[PDB]
């Protein structure tokens, strides 16, 4: 009963753990039991050094690798040499002011230390194994979980704790129970012994999707690693949310599976209880590096009161050791000065002294011992103990409990998961892919029908663009790779599976839905384009068009695995796209490829694909020759040495032209087999699928380094208020949101007020609704209905109320880049009322800095949570960053002093009382409050779990009122030495494993307190005495200066883009190298343009997802804080993308105009300095205007994927309706009106125009047709007639009468009309480009407003 984990009403932990441990020592030869410990003696870490730090940008970033190279041919020391054993079944708790070293110490403990390396001194050894073998066999058996709570953010609780489970589910399990059930028991009693069973199916959100409350994210990360079963732990830091009660609870889940399954654990906590610190065995003191004590956790106040410090009668153990480091709140003893005898004050004294004091010896004592002992047994049974653990099959030398293909098989449910949540982006890849089928094969239906020769050029474009298309859309798998980098690295380290695993699973999750688009698309295109012959000949083409997805996919995989961030990617795959779109021998043929650039047609298996499938769509099948040359009316009696066929390949006067001799000609494809494409590309699948798992697995990271300090280098290089008179109240707030179409209350009949001139605490357990109640007071509330009446001043809150608040996330949302002081700066300017000066606002600033001690490190870099800035230093940012903006009617403090060291907590405090003293209403949650910090306080609100009030009033002089109410409506007495901030929680049973006696809602609703407060707020209803700060342009100018800051400063988007247009230009440029002005020539010149604009895709989607990053940030924080407007943030994010767009305009012309030889025709012409300037402005619009479809195409989607995936249906139906694609006299429809419409139409025409027009051919001998004209007439006069109706020219022997050679365009102009391309259409062109960007973007900025802005 009471270890049935679902069964709310009785489960224990503990008797779960002790009847599991009677199971298992039951038979100890098949559960196998062990122990592990460590003991490491000198260890000492090192890292960079400010030499060279520094924030990274566009401009330095050459120097920079240039320094890095000088450096690979004065590091900082962290951890400065430490010691200390730790038996296994004995807790450890290590302690130390924040920077102090105690996660670097953690991590180096658990042979986990990426990023700074340890000495070469140091010794470690886990009973017998060194540090190596721990991660080569073992890494398992010693778990380090971050401070970072990393998970996926949409799946839910129960899938993230049940896919662990499944992985980790050991064999010798119950030796009755099957791996199903096992997992999902396993997981179920790891969720309710942490108090998150209500939580089973929230998504595990993150700081920007709202799922569980951040306490209920550490807690799922903690019940992770618990799942685990591992038997070394290390804490980073546990309790950063968690409250008092559910912090010993957690404390005690450890506690007794240690001494009750011989597990050690590494605790870093940073605040706890004193009966919490009552449970370790050893202790740890860390400052600024140096180890002071270590040794048993009972004697460390005895030993540094023999130093000369002295505890003050009210403070714990713990905060006393913290309170040693600090020189401020140490409290020397006067009584030994007077003696003489000094008192280390500096860490390096402390240390000396330690290491001087006899403790140390009977330490080493100890340690030696343990690092001495070798048994060639303790060893053995962990090995024993493991290869038993393992399943069946999976090899013995492996870190993980399952084989392989389970390991693939579990990911791969999890995967398949995601899809479920992605399901919308899924589904409209399927929709737009049949309709862009249904679309082209329109552009086709009624032309193939004639099946003369006028199939042997639209049925081989129609293939090349279906794959073509097909290569598109496999560029959009990229986006997969990135979400799952973190998560599967934390997953690593827990030694659960391969990555190659998930890269796997990936690939599986993947296939359906690339078999289903594929038979659509390929059976729509087929029946209504090809040859459409049901025989075996189109399940060949289906056989092969699948082949070739696969290979596209998966060569974009294995390039896009080789990166840290999807701009990056797009290098890659922008290169790999381009060189598969001209290299596939129908752009530019087999013959034509130039000799510089060959190599690429063998490595490219779209190249043998297509080839395999003309082998399929012309051999051994003829068509009649249509487009004599001399034709019309004007000949009869013709003769075959007298006619020609204009088709290549064609016989000499016959009307057999087969289609082997036309693949001889055209694409040189005269060999017999077809089955050649299919081995080669399946042989490139398989390949580049283990090269990509390879890659994804052996040579792949994306781990943290650590908290380092960036100062930019043109920084290290040279180195209250006043009163508010109006309250703020409520009633009867109820709040209610929808859970698995099971809506759930969080909030209920919540009343209280906060008025000028005090200081209101909010406590409560983790998951009640603290977050929740501050959300719906300030106006920030997305999902649900709220109901009640919030008011100011008896007035419902106006629309100026939004900025009037100060509200402090519990969440740290601020740039990657932007500075500290900076931040708060900007946060002054545009929060601050406007009618005072820059210098005023710069100087409170100041004096914000000053208050709040940051000056230290005023100019670094935000960074990431867990990479560039402490936790102490992110909160003390945030709570400055709405300092600054000078409230007027509350402050709010979500967090300001959880998870941090006591004594940073108390200096928060101390400022928060301060404030409060000054005239400012605030109203903070507070999680762990010692004592000392309850006496600043002056009313409580009290939450039990749902969101239910249980208290609200004055805490009095000691606590006494709070004390006074619970124990004069039943509960047991508070002890003297108890904290009364522990008591309360304790009665009223919010820890997860304990329950009250009482529901004490229903107490508060039926005391007079609540009555006196209901009073209260009646009467205060009878009460009787813009939207944003500064004008929106002014706003505009700082937010775009700030995101100018932004691109600069973020070298990985701009210098990224930079390489690609760069090299890409230089490919395409290149391959096109001097086309000349032949037909051939000719030709090339219009398909480089053609070509030109294949980019649009990778250059695009470069952009999208640093835009989707920007607009989470400015969502989560910055719009409902009203600090500016949402059409200054599309103003900005506009005004910025353009001028970089321009300048990549301006690169790419020069970098691809000239080698092309544009500028050859331009010259010849007479009109160079015309066309080069107008080629160059029709770069720069086409820059702009794919950075602004990308815009477009953003504003109204929340996932990337979709939007991307938007842009190129909307590219590729551009793009099919254009060029020679199909002819416009061919296609007389109704489909004509998306031709005129569409923008690429314009761009290409007058591109065109612009490069080659007005300019004469120059036919070479392999092109000229030839034929012998009628006896006794002379060339001239036979094709005269011919003339007058084709406009054409260029007889190559006007007088000769044997034979003559003709082509049949002469003037350039012709060839360029053949398109509807005109040179005196080009100014217009111009025009309508710019007016469609124009266009572009005001759809964009309306697009926003309609979708995003609520
Ligand atoms: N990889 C690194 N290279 C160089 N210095 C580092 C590195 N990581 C951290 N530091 C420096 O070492 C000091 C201590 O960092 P530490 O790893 O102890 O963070 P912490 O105190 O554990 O904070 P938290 O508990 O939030 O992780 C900091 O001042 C930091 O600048
Ligand atoms: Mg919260």
């Known amino acids: 009963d009471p270890k049935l984990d679902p069964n709310s009403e009785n489960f224990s932990s503990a008797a779960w753990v002790k009847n599991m441990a009677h199971l298992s020592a039951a038979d100890p030869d098949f559960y196998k039991p062990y122990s592990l410990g460590c003991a490491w003696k000198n260890l000492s870490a090192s890292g960079a050094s400010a030499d060279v730090a520094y924030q990274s940008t566009v401009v330095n970033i050459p120097y920079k690798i240039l320094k890095s190279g000088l450096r690979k041919f004065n590091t900082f020391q962290i951890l400065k040499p430490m010691d200390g054993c730790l038996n296994p079944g004995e807790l450890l708790v290590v302690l130390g002011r924040p920077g102090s070293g105690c996660t670097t110490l953690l991590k180096s403990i658990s042979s986990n230390t990426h990023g700074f390396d340890l000495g070469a001194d140091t010794k470690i050894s886990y009973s017998g194994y060194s540090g190596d073998d721990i991660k080569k066999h073992f890494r398992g058996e010693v778990v380090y979980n971050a401070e970072a709570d990393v998970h996926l953010p949409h799946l839910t609780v129960f899938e993230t704790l049940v896919t662990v489970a499944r992985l980790k589910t050991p064999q010798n399990r119950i030796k009755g129970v099957d791996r199903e059930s096992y997992a999902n028991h396993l997981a179920e009693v790891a969720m309710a012994t942490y108090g998150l069973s209500h939580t089973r199916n929230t998504k595990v959100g993150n700081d920007i999707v709202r799922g569980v409350s951040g306490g209920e994210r550490k807690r799922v990360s903690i019940a992770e690693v618990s799942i685990c079963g591992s038997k070394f732990q290390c804490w980073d830091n546990a309790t950063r949310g968690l409250d008092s009660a559910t912090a010993l609870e957690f404390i005690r889940a450890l506690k007794?599976?240690?001494?009750?399954?011989?597990?050690?654990?590494?605790?870093?906590?940073?605040?706890?209880?004193?009966?919490?610190?009552?449970?370790?065995?050893?202790?740890?003191?860390?400052?600024?590096?140096?180890?002071?004590?270590?040794?048993?956790?009972?004697?460390?106040?005895?030993?540094?009161?023999?130093?000369?410090?002295?505890?003050?009668?009210?403070?714990?153990?713990?905060?006393?050791?913290?309170?040693?480091?600090?020189?401020?709140?140490?409290?020397?003893?006067?009584?030994?000065?007077?003696?003489?005898?000094?008192?280390?004050?500096?860490?390096?004294?402390?240390?000396?002294?330690?290491?001087?004091?006899?403790?140390?010896?009977?330490?080493?004592?100890?340690?030696?011992?343990?690092?001495?002992?070798?048994?060639?047994?303790s060893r053995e049974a962990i090995k024993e103990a493991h290869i038993a653990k393992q399943?069946?099959?999976?090899?013995?030398?492996?870190?993980?409990?399952?084989?392989?293909?389970?390991?693939?098989?579990?990911?791969?449910?999890?995967?398949?998961?995601?899809?479920?949540?992605?399901?919308?982006?899924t589904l409209f890849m399927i929709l737009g892919n049949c309709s862009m089928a249904l679309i082209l094969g329109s552009m086709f239906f009624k032309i193939m029908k004639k099946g003369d020769t006028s199939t042997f050029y639209f049925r081989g474009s129609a293939m090349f663009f279906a794959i073509l298309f097909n290569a598109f859309s496999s560029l959009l798998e990229i986006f997969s790779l990135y979400e799952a980098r973190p998560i599967t690295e934390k997953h690593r380290t827990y030694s659960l599976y391969h990555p190659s695993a998930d890269a796997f699973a990936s690939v599986?999750?993947?296939?359906?839905?690339?078999?289903?688009?594929?038979?659509?698309?390929?059976?729509?295109?087929?029946?209504?384009?090809?040859?459409?012959?049901?025989?075996?000949?189109?399940?060949?083409?289906?056989?092969?068009?699948?082949?070739?997805?696969?290979?596209?996919?998966?060569?974009?995989?294995?390039?896009?695995?080789?990166?840290?961030?999807?701009?990056?990617?797009?290098?890659?795959?922008?290169?790999?796209?381009?060189?598969?779109?001209?290299?596939?021998?129908?752009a530019i043929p087999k013959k034509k490829i130039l000799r510089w650039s060959k190599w690429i047609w063998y490595i490219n298996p779209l190249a043998y694909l297509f080839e395999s499938l003309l082998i399929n769509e012309f051999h051994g099948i003829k068509f009649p020759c249509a487009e004599y040359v001399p034709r019309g009316p004007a000949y009869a009696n013709i003769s075959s040495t007298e006619s020609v066929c204009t088709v290549v390949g064609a016989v000499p006067g016959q009307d057999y032209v087969l289609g082997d001799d036309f693949i001889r000609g055209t694409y040189q494809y005269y060999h017999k087999d077809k089955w050649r494409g299919f081995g080669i590309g399946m042989a490139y699948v398989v390949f580049f699928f283990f090269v990509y798992l390879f890659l994804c697995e052996y040579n792949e990271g994306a781990k943290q380094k650590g908290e380092i300090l960036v100062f930019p280098r043109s920084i290290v290089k040279r180195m209250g208020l006043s009163k508010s008179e109006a309250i703020f109240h409520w009633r009867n707030l109820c709040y209610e949101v929808q859970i698995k179409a099971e809506t759930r209350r969080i909030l209920n009949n919540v009343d209280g007020w906060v008025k000028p001139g005090t200081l209101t605490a909010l406590m409560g357990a983790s998951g009640a609704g603290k977050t929740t109640l501050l959300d719906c007071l300030a106006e920030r509330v997305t999902m649900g209905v709220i109901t009640g009446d919030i008011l100011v001043n008896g007035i419902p809150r106006d629309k100026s109320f939004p900025r009037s608040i100060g509200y402090c996330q519990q969440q740290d949302l601020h740039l990657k880049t932007a500075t500290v002081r900076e931040s708060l700066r900007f946060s002054a300017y545009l929060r601050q009322p406007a009618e005072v000066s820059i210098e005023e606002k710069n100087r409170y600033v100041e004096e914000v800095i000053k208050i709040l001690e940051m000056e230290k490190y005023a100019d670094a870099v935000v960074g990431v949570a867990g990479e560039g800035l402490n936790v102490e230093q992110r909160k003390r940012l945030t709570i400055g960053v709405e300092l600054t903006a000078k409230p007027k009617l509350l402050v709010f403090l979500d967090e300001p002093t959880s998870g941090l060291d006591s004594q940073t907590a108390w200096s928060i405090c101390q400022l928060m009382k301060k404030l409060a003293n000054h005239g400012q209403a605030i109203l903070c949650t507070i999680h762990q409050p010692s004592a000392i910090l309850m006496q600043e306080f002056d009313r409580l609100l009290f939450m039990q779990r749902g969101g239910k009030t249980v208290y609200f009033g004055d805490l009095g002089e000691g606590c006494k009122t709070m004390i006074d109410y619970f124990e004069s409506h039943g509960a047991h007495k508070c002890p003297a030495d108890a904290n009364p901030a522990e008591w309360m929680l304790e009665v009223v049973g919010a820890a997860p494993g304990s329950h009250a006696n009482q529901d004490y809602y229903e107490v508060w609703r039926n005391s007079e307190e609540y009555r006196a407060v209901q009073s209260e707020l009646d009467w205060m209803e009878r009460e009787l005495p813009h939207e944003f700060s500064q004008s929106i342009i002014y706003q505009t100018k700082l937010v775009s200066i700030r995101l100018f800051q932004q691109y600069w400063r973020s070298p990985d988007y701009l210098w990224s883009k930079f390489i690609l247009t760069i090299f890409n230009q230089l490919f395409i440029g290149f391959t096109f190298f001097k086309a000349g002005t032949s037909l051939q020539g000719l030709q090339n010149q219009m398909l480089a343009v053609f070509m030109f604009t294949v980019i649009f895709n990778p250059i695009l989607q470069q952009y999208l997802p640093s835009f989707v990053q920007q607009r989470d940030l400015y969502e989560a924080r910055e719009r409902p804080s009203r600090t500016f407007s949402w059409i200054s943030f599309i103003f900005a994010q506009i005004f910025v993308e353009v001028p970089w767009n321009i300048l990549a305009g301006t690169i790419a012309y020069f970098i691809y105009y000239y080698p092309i030889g544009f500028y050859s025709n331009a010259s010849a012409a007479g009109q160079l300095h015309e066309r080069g300037a107008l080629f160059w402005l029709f770069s720069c619009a086409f820059y702009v205007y794919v950075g602004s479809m990308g815009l477009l195409v953003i504003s109204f989607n929340q996932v990337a994927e979709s939007a991307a995936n938007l842009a190129s249906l909307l590219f590729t139906m551009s793009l099919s309706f254009c060029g020679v694609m199909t002819t416009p006299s061919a296609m007389p429809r109704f489909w004509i009106f998306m031709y005129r419409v569409s923008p690429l139409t314009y761009f290409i025409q007058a591109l065109l125009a612009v490069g080659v027009a007005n300019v004469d051919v120059k036919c070479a001998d392999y092109e000229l047709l030839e034929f012998t004209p009628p006896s006794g007439m002379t060339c001239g006069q036979y094709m005269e007639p011919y003339l007058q109706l084709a406009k054409t020219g260029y007889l190559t022997d006007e007088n000769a009468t044997d034979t003559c050679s003709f082509c049949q365009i002469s003037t350039t102009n012709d060839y360029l009309a053949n398109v509807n391309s005109f040179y005196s259409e080009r100014w217009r062109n111009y025009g309508i480009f710019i007016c469609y960007i124009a266009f572009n973007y005001i759809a964009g900025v309306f697009f926003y407003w309609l979708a995003r802005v609520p």
């Not at 030696?368 to 060639?376: F, G, V, Y």
């Not at 999976?394 to 949540?421: F, G």
């Not at 390929?522 to 997805?549: E, H, K, Q, S, T």
């Open 256 to 377: 007794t599976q240690a001494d009750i399954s011989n597990t050690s654990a590494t605790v870093a906590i940073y605040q706890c209880s004193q009966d919490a610190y009552d449970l370790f065995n050893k202790v740890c003191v860390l400052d600024d590096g140096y180890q002071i004590y270590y040794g048993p956790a009972d004697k460390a106040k005895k030993y540094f009161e023999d130093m000369g410090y002295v505890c003050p009668s009210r403070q714990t153990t713990a905060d006393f050791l913290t309170s040693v480091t600090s020189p401020s709140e140490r409290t020397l003893n006067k009584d030994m000065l007077k003696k003489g005898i000094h008192i280390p004050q500096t860490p390096k004294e402390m240390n000396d002294y330690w290491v001087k004091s006899p403790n140390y010896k009977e330490l080493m004592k100890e340690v030696d011992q343990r690092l001495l002992n070798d048994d060639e047994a």
């Open 391 to 425: 399943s069946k099959r999976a090899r013995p030398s492996s870190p993980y409990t399952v084989s392989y293909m389970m390991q693939v098989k579990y990911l791969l449910i999890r995967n398949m998961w995601r899809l479920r949540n992605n399901i919308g982006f």
């Open 508 to 586: 599986l999750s993947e296939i359906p839905s690339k078999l289903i688009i594929a038979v659509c698309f390929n059976i729509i295109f087929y029946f209504l384009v090809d040859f459409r012959r049901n025989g075996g000949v189109f399940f060949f083409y289906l056989l092969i068009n699948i082949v070739a997805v696969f290979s596209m996919s998966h060569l974009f995989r294995c390039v896009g695995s080789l990166t840290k961030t999807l701009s990056e990617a797009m290098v890659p795959a922008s290169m790999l796209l381009l060189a598969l779109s001209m290299y596939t021998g129908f």
